[PDB]
Design a protein around this ligand. Sequence first.
Ligand code: HEM
Ligand code: HEM
Ligand SMILES: Cc1cc(N)nc(C[C@@H]2CNC[C@H]2OCCNCCc2cccc(F)c2)c1
Ligand SMILES: Cc1cc(N)nc(C[C@@H]2CNC[C@H]2OCCNCCc2cccc(F)c2)c1
Ligand SMILES: C[C@H](O)[C@H](O)[C@H]1CNc2nc(N)[nH]c(=O)c2N1
Ligand SMILES: C[C@H](O)[C@H](O)[C@H]1CNc2nc(N)[nH]c(=O)c2N1
Ligand SMILES: [Zn+2]
Lengths: 407, 411
Amino acid sequence: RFLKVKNWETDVVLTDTLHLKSTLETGCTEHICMGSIMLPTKDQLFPLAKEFLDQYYSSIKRFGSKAHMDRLEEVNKEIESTSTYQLKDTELIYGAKHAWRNASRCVGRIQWSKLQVFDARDCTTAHGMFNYICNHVKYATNKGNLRSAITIFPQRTDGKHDFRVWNSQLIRYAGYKQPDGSTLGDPANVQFTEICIQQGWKAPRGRFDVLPLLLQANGNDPELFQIPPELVLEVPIRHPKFDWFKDLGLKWYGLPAVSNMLLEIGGLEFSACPFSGWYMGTEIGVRDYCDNSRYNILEEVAKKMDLDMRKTSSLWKDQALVEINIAVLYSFQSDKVTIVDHHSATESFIKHMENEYRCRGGCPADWVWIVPPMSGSITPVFHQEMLNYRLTPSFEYQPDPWNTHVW
Amino acid sequence: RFLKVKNWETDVVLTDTLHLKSTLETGCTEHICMGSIMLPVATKDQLFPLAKEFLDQYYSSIKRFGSKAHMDRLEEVNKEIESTSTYQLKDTELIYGAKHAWRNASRCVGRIQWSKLQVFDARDCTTAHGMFNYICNHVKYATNKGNLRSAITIFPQRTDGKHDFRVWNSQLIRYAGYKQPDGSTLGDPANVQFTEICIQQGWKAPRGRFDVLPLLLQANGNDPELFQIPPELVLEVPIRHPKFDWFKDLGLKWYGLPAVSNMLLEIGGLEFSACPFSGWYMGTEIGVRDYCDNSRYNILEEVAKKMDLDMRKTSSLWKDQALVEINIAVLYSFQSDKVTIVDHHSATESFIKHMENEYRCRGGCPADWVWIVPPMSGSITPVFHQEMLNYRLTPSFEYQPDPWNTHVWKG
Ligand code: HEM
Ligand code: HEM
Ligand SMILES: Cc1cc(N)nc(C[C@@H]2CNC[C@H]2OCCNCCc2cccc(F)c2)c1
Ligand SMILES: Cc1cc(N)nc(C[C@@H]2CNC[C@H]2OCCNCCc2cccc(F)c2)c1
Ligand SMILES: C[C@H](O)[C@H](O)[C@H]1CNc2nc(N)[nH]c(=O)c2N1
Ligand SMILES: C[C@H](O)[C@H](O)[C@H]1CNc2nc(N)[nH]c(=O)c2N1
Ligand SMILES: [Zn+2]
């Protein structure tokens, strides 16, 4: 029941007791490991509420206190008639921060307690949503000195009155299929970009066209909105040594802001809850630029470096991937926009795991996601055993709204 | 039940039904995943069932499931079990067994080659000296002047667990490590403890950065004895870089034959505690892990110095930058000496082909993503984008405790 993790580089051994307060299911059985799978009512809504308040009140050292009990009964009452309930602000803030704290795929959690939570539960329209979003973007960007935040729209009711942001991120680049079969911009968003044009977006059909936001309030048809360009901090990508780097025409946005997840607190479901932090250099440099079905610029970059592309074994893909990633970090630093490299982010997460083990008794962690997609073994998380388990409050994936919605 | 895995790069979905033919637990539960944990005397009662399963498998693969020869083999094994409390695998069975252990090794990216594996039956061996001879002939055959060939050598199975054959080395060829007074290590820091044991056992250590350790061999439960592999049998490659001439001045070399010798081979209930096997290296094994792990030779710093890198700030990717050059240098030296080696791009691509084919013809390929994904440049290799299912099939290679921890000394 007590479980140990070992780091094979330092011989450090931590004892996990947090996973016994674990509640959702991992997808694994005693017979099969699914660690590398991307995605493995009144009766129900109450015990969830009770478990959440138990954990809240214990955190502010008023476990078993009268305020605790009184809140419990007050929630049970709203439930026994309304079929749902409302979080207090303090609960909402605590629940958000913990959903981040329990995000087993997030390497950036050392920062979990400094989250800014904008309570948008008084929202009622897509224009409302647009205004909350712009405000969130502007606060988070903070002229390049980024700050974590999450904006929380009204919780689910009957599930036909959901609030949803259809973009998978607040800020992402257009994808256009072409009459030769190739792609322009970002192929990950090709479908979304069609959905935007087929709702009436006039697309400039260029390589780095910031997508329009597309927002659904209270079950309604969703609606388009251009984020004010002066709110989208973008970084032109250049290299410290390679003067030529600049003319590949690359740039990237400063604000990563995940917008398609569902926030679950005490059995309540916040289907629209965009959140934002700041980039680790590899997300842009390795994945965004070099993933085969993304910008796929390796072929081109190594060309400029005059390396030997005649064999996989000259490691030309690898040499170029490094320079690209040196370039992304250099651009963001030079431009005073927050970015962290994969060495420093992983070191921090080691320090954070260590903290969470002594303060909480563990830290759910998903090794497949925490190990950066380059230079794995030269970062210390590589040598670190991690236990993956699902704690609540939490962020969960949810179907792309366009499969679900009813017009 | 059927389970699907998606490759997120090419959108290929595959369907695993093979995980159903799978008895051993994983370490995971419905409530916790231990996918990244390194490590999460059998009786009559248990033995027959395991023999049966195995022989059912064997006879299926030769399309003789149900045949007189099948029924009579079962009955001969059952008989032999009741009479002797163990049993003897036929040669054909042992070969099939070893091949299937490898094919089932979910942490091995090299499995495309599983059916081509040379099996040496050393079940007649009785002494350490007989082991030294077997192993020498394994090394010579497998090395094959740089054109490496897969091989495994199998010594007598465990009996009462008191008469074990063991190769105390973790690999048949590995460099000494020496902890000095000042805290630093000369040679490979991974082999310090084993090195100490060798010296204790009477090995005179040359005390250089690349001393090939002696074989330390235990037969029939006996105390192990020391043997120097003939050095003309130990093929080595001095490491240089195609463009950096100072690289050779680092003084690096490596042996060409990766040969694991601490694992246990389980076939139809039988445990072969000594079964060293060898193939050939993936470049990153030497260049990433052996040279660049902080707990190994750790040349990252020395190489970065020599490159005039900006080492004052990690965000310069000076570690990433040297890592690649070292891996370039390892592939280049092996290829130039005509010693078989494979880069991670080609190994991973090969593995994806193997795994697809395995789903086609077998209904699955157990695979451990944590281990299949190479330790540099993960997402530019196609395994990174591949969902994998991991589970335990037998025949299998299992871990066993280090024998110095379990061995009963006779004097
Ligand atoms: C402060 C800087 C942060 C960094 C550097 C960071 C880093 C990351 C990375 C690298 C991933 C894996 C994504 C990928 O490679 O596709 C990730 C996943 C995730 N992170 Fe963070 N994080 C940060 C802040 C946040 C915040 C503020 C939240 C929420 C409040 C969050 C919640 C999550 C969640 C729920 C996932 C998994 C969802 C997915 O599949 O994308 N992180 N994080
Ligand atoms: C043909 C060339 C081969 C290559 C390139 C290869 C590659 C690898 C690599 C890279 C690993 C992970 C070890 C690490 O990086 O620490 C591994 C694991 C393994 N492979 Fe292979 N392999 C080859 C041949 C073989 C053979 C002949 C066998 C047995 C017949 C085998 C069975 C195994 C086993 C049992 C493991 C687990 C090792 C451990 O857990 O430490 N492979 N393979
Ligand atoms: C808040 C925050 C900060 C930060 N630095 N980083 C993040 C990760 C974003 C979230 N989500 C992907 C990452 O951005 C990378 C974009 N690639 C998409 C990966 C993908 C494709 C298809 C299916 C999937 F399940 C996942 C969030
Ligand atoms: C036959 C063959 C060919 C090849 N290319 N590569 C190999 C991998 C060897 C096996 N064994 C690891 C690799 O050699 C590296 C040694 N590291 C030991 C890994 C380890 C450490 C602590 C706990 C564990 F559970 C496991 C075999
Ligand atoms: C197949 C595998 O699950 C998939 O490629 C995962 C692996 N690790 C990842 N890790 C991060 N950080 N982000 C990802 O998108 C992925 N993809
Ligand atoms: C903690 C973690 O499981 C451990 O460091 C693993 C990760 N992946 C690995 N992968 C390979 N090929 N070889 C290894 O030794 C390891 N080590
Ligand atoms: Zn698992």
